[PDB]
Scaffold this active site. Structure first.
Site, PDB file in Angstrom:
ATOM      1  N   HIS A  25       0.802  -1.212   0.000  1.00  0.00           N
ATOM      2  CA  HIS A  25       0.000   0.000   0.000  1.00  0.00           C
ATOM      3  C   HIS A  25       0.839   1.269   0.000  1.00  0.00           C
ATOM      4  O   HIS A  25       0.275   2.360  -0.153  1.00  0.00           O
ATOM      5  CB  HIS A  25      -0.982  -0.018   1.176  1.00  0.00           C
ATOM      6  CG  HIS A  25      -0.364   0.213   2.520  1.00  0.00           C
ATOM      7  ND1 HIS A  25      -0.054  -0.817   3.380  1.00  0.00           N
ATOM      8  CD2 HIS A  25      -0.073   1.357   3.185  1.00  0.00           C
ATOM      9  CE1 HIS A  25       0.429  -0.319   4.506  1.00  0.00           C
ATOM     10  NE2 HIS A  25       0.427   0.998   4.413  1.00  0.00           N
ATOM     11  N   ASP A  36       0.291  -7.787   1.501  1.00  0.00           N
ATOM     12  CA  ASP A  36       0.709  -6.386   1.589  1.00  0.00           C
ATOM     13  C   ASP A  36       2.237  -6.316   1.708  1.00  0.00           C
ATOM     14  O   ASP A  36       2.806  -6.082   2.772  1.00  0.00           O
ATOM     15  CB  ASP A  36      -0.011  -5.716   2.759  1.00  0.00           C
ATOM     16  CG  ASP A  36       0.186  -4.210   2.812  1.00  0.00           C
ATOM     17  OD1 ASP A  36       0.705  -3.616   1.847  1.00  0.00           O
ATOM     18  OD2 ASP A  36      -0.195  -3.614   3.841  1.00  0.00           O
ATOM     19  N   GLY A  91       2.237   6.514   9.622  1.00  0.00           N
ATOM     20  CA  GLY A  91       3.565   6.923   9.230  1.00  0.00           C
ATOM     21  C   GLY A  91       4.620   5.857   9.437  1.00  0.00           C
ATOM     22  O   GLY A  91       5.731   5.992   8.909  1.00  0.00           O
ATOM     23  N   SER A 102       3.988   2.720   8.389  1.00  0.00           N
ATOM     24  CA  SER A 102       3.707   1.770   7.311  1.00  0.00           C
ATOM     25  C   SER A 102       4.973   1.351   6.588  1.00  0.00           C
ATOM     26  O   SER A 102       5.839   2.175   6.293  1.00  0.00           O
ATOM     27  CB  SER A 102       2.750   2.395   6.286  1.00  0.00           C
ATOM     28  OG  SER A 102       1.405   2.082   6.585  1.00  0.00           O
ATOM     29  N   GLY A 103       5.073   0.059   6.301  1.00  0.00           N
ATOM     30  CA  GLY A 103       6.189  -0.443   5.542  1.00  0.00           C
ATOM     31  C   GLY A 103       7.414  -0.751   6.360  1.00  0.00           C
ATOM     32  O   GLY A 103       8.332  -1.388   5.832  1.00  0.00           O
TER      33      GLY A 103
END
Lengths: 223, 163
Positions: free
Chosen positions: A40, A84, A175, A177-178
């Site tokens: 995402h 994801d 913030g 994410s990933g």
């Protein structure tokens, strides 16, 4: 990261930032030329920043490297958040130093109760917003899949796991994410989603990287 | 699936900031609540010519990122980001039809997306995530425009940060 601590400059050398004129996602360096992040987080013309501790300073032990290839998992499902995971090939190899080093892929999935390190530059508040200058860290345990499905009925696939505390107070937040979830020295998770941040009975949910090691290795071998 | 952008050229944030939905056709109308049918309290979302710029909204995704893409499923809400009241939903209710209303509950993945349309953005409602979406438009009644499903006739908005 809500409820965490300041990592320190050399502590998470595999953490990177995805940048497009602003920081918008974390990622993990898994070798000198390849990064793992969340599907995402895909964006055109991503720049990877490596060796950053203070996100707001332009220091010189950092590296800015363009993405040459950004490969979302072919089965990424935007309706279910399943699969994801995204691979980024950097346009040039990173130079490794005190603040830039790779994290390796796991040999097996991690068990319930194992303590992991989750890191990022996201919001540090569960109500309202506050974004840090320096990288933040959190130690949190892996939860059994049954409890994960019990916290989030009908939403947990086999490629997800929960980590954190149902008492709340400590979690990844917007913030992050990933970003990496590291357990026993191996990359086990990617920050993905959750219901709020640090809420009671609502732990963070993470991409189960152990299920993807074959695809990662194949993609790197083919690119 | 591009990033949603406000009138200042900045990415719309995930929950942190409120935004006015500024119509390009109406011009002198802003988001407000109105009574629908037999209800005592105003629970239907309307565009009111008398209430401009209107009530600001927040765009919320469970994803741990602080930008909103046009591809993200969203909750839209009046009021504070953490508060569970003022969450938009679509309710079949006479005499409006598939009416946009507020409720006191917040589902994990919302049923809305924000999609580029013409010179601004439209709100699109998805009865289920696997399906095609339905544009939110306007049903003119009682000198106000009830927001309701009106596929093919979307209301086009610019997104102006409340600041």
């Amino acid at each position: 990261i809500v409820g965490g601590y300041t990592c320190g400059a050399n502590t998470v050398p595999y953490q990177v930032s995805l940048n497009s004129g602003y920081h918008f996602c974390g990622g993990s360096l898994i070798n000198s030329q390849w990064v793992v992040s969340a599907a995402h987080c895909y964006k055109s013309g991503i720049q990877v920043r490596l060796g950053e501790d203070n996100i707001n300073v332009v220091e010189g032990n950092e590296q800015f490297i363009s993405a040459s290839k950004s490969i979302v998992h072919p089965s990424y499902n935007s309706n279910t958040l399943n699969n994801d995971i995204m691979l980024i090939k950097l346009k040039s190899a990173a130079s490794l130093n005190s603040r830039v080093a790779s994290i390796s892929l796991p040999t097996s999935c991690a068990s319930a109760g194992t303590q992991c390190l989750i890191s990022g530059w996201g919001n540090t508040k569960s109500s309202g917003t506050s974004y840090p200058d320096v990288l933040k860290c959190l130690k949190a345990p892996i939860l059994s899949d049954s409890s994960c499905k019990s916290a989030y009925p009908g939403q947990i696939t086999s490629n997800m796991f929960c980590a954190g505390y149902l008492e709340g107070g400590k979690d990844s937040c917007q913030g992050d994410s990933g970003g990496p979830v590291v357990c026993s020295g191996k990359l086990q998770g990617i920050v993905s989603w959750g219901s709020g941040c640090a809420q009671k009975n609502k732990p963070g949910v993470y991409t189960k990287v152990c299920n993807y090691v074959s695809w990662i290795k194949q993609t790197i071998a083919s690119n | 699936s591009s990033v949603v952008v406000d009138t200042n050229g900045q990415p719309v944030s995930n929950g942190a900031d409120a935004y006015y939905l500024v119509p390009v056709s109406h011009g002198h109308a802003g988001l407000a609540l109105a009574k629908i049918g037999n209800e005592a309290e105003p629970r239907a979302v309307v565009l009111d010519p008398h209430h401009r710029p209107g009530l600001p909204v927040r765009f919320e995704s469970p994803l741990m990122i602080n930008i909103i893409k046009e591809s993200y499923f969203l909750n839209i809400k009046f009021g504070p980001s953490s508060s569970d009241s003022g969450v938009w939903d679509v309710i079949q209710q006479d005499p409006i039809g598939l009416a946009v209303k507020v409720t006191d509950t917040k589902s994990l993945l919302g049923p809305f997306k924000v999609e580029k349309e013409g010179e601004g953005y439209k709100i699109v409602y998805y009865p289920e995530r696997g399906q095609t979406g339905l544009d939110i438009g306007l049903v003119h009644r009682n000198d106000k425009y009830y927001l309701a499903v009106k596929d093919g006739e979307p209301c086009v908005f610019k997104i102006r940060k409340a600041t």
